Amino acid sequence: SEFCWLTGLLEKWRFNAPEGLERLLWIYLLIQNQYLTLLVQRTMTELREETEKSYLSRFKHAHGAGVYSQVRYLEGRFAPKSDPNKMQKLLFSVLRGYWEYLSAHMSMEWVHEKPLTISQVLDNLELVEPHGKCVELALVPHFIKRKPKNGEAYPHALLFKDLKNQAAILMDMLKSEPRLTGWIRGVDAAANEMHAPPELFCPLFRVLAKSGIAHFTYHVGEDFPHLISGIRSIDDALRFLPLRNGDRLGHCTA
């Protein structure tokens, strides 16, 4: 819509423009710019992304303008929610978006043409096969590390409370529907590093692995007090996290 509108406006102003409207256009464009800069340099708005519209958009962009998907393998990273209900809502949104994306390109017996539950969605999806025409999704929950609080039994105790909560939620969905494991492939711990050192997560990663989480990821080396500090972070992550062959770390800028 904006594309068409600005196109028409510019066409009408091909030779000249009313200065008042034109001042309106500077101000509009500028406001856009600074708001955008603020945003990039940076919750409810993200929650508004919890419809099968944003993810379908993501998928259509990932696919090129052609019949074959421009990308092959996509990683779908999502923030875990402390509510089982919010968790499942997000998951169903993502899955339905992916199914609709694939449907928009392939014709086949979809069992549930209008699925409504994650179970139905997986029922649709399992009939899909890796030809490569469309994108192949892999999903990963974020772990956000917050600065430790003033008073607690041990460092990052409360943050660990929250993270175990999210993890219990996740493993219990895994139990209820084991089929998702073909889709929730790995878990990643992101966010500013100094707020928590990695070891806080090794038991978390271990229990998740036993839950059935293949793959693990953890941001490192990105930001740090001293380059030596970043290097130490990275190596300790190596020697502590339950990372197997082929796992992937992240930035490691140190």
Partner: protein, 383 residues
């Protein structure tokens, strides 16, 4: 015994509502019955409704026992398994209908998925039983439910489980208890259907009356359908199982009185009772003592067995007074009976003082006033 056998025959010629009922011990008889069936019908572990958390549906309980039976008959020796989980998941998903205190709209489109139209949990259950008997190669399933004397309220719930889910020809119900409580509970929540303002406003004899007539008629008619009389069981009582005054005695019972009791010292049952009374009653062997013991052979088997098991137990203990060893037994037998009688409770205040006042209280409560001091167990109340 014989009763359970006729019952076995009756349910057997039923697969050829579908709910047998047993009036009334009760649990022992039902357990024996289930053992009897071990014409292929598969039994369920007995359902003790009173022994269930306040939040379960009879249907979920049934589904759980069915799950175990199907799965283990399945681990014995596939796609039947695979087919079963489909029904299981359908049940899980449609399960909310019962629990939900409100309708969530999302359940609507849920009901819009796919043979009657909707998400009938009862039909889902019927395909469930279809699969179950198809896999177990049995003609039907018996659902065996315990009396709800300890909680007569949960029973209602089993009643609706029956009505809404068990209107199938491959399932048969075995209920147990006293239909009087059934009547009350069904009535009680019949009354609960009215509008509070309605009765709050129409508190006059006339309208009270016709609504009572309506509720009572509906209770009667609904009990008719739920417990059709033909398949109800009256059951034989202990005294009915024992000669009234010796001119009877199909299947002598005989009880153990001494630890040795090598099956030849069994002092009848009627005779043991008569000895216990007469000697503890210093009662002679006349007609009233007989009829006294007849009004003893009524008492529920648990009470009588305890009262006649503590009798000879303590007699043997003391022998390595009959009236006091027996009095202590009667005390335990009727304590809450005596307790609600409002009579002397402490045992340190027996004397003969309290006895006269307590006899006065008994005679006044029995009205009588003519032969009350006879203390005849002739009153209408078993208390």
């Amino acid at each position: 015994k014989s009763l359970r056998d006729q019952l076995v025959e009756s349910i057997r010629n039923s697969i050829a509502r579908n709910v047998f009922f047993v009036d009334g011990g009760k649990t022992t008889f039902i357990n024996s019955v289930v053992k009897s069936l071990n014409v292929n019908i598969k039994c369920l572990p007995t359902i003790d409704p009173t022994k269930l958390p306040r939040h379960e549906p009879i249907l979920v309980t049934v589904t759980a026992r069915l799950n175990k039976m199907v799965s283990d008959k399945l681990k014995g020796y596939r796609k039947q398994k695979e087919q079963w989980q489909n029904h299981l998941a359908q049940l899980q998903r449609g399960l909310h209908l019962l629990t939900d205190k409100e309708y969530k709209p999302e359940y609507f489109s849920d009901a819009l998925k796919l043979s009657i139209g909707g998400q009938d949990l009862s039909e889902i259950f019927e395909e469930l039983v279809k699969r179950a008997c198809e896999i177990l190669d049995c003609k039907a399933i018996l659902i065996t439910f315990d009396d709800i004397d300890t909680q007569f309220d949960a029973g209602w719930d089993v009643l609706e489980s029956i009505r809404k889910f068990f209107n199938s020809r491959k399932l048969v119900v075995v209920a147990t208890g006293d239909l009087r409580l059934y009547s009350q509970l069904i009535r009680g929540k019949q009354y609960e259907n009215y509008s509070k303002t309605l009765l709050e406003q129409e508190k006059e004899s006339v309208r009270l009356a016709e609504r009572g007539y309506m509720v009572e008629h509906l209770e009667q008619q609904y009990l008719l359908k739920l417990f059709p009389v033909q398949k109800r069981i009256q059951l034989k009582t202990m005294l009915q199982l024992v000669g009234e005054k010796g001119k009877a005695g199909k299947e002598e019972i005989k009880v153990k009185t001494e630890p040795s009791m090598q099956d030849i010292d069994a002092i009848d049952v009627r005779q043991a009772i008569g000895d216990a009374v007469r000697e503890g009653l210093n009662l002679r062997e006349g007609s009233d003592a007989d009829m006294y013991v007849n009004e003893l052979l009524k008492q529920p088997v648990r009470l009588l067995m305890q009262v006649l098991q503590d009798f000879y137990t303590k007699k043997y203990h003391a022998t390595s007074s009959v009236p006091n060893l027996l009095r202590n037994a009667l005390y335990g037998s009727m304590l809450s009976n005596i307790y609600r009688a409002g009579l002397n409770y402490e045992q340190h205040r027996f004397g003969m003082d309290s006895l006269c006042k307590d006899i006065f209280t008994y005679v006044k409560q029995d009205r009588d006033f003519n032969t009350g001091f006879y203390l005849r167990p002739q009153s209408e109340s078993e208390a």
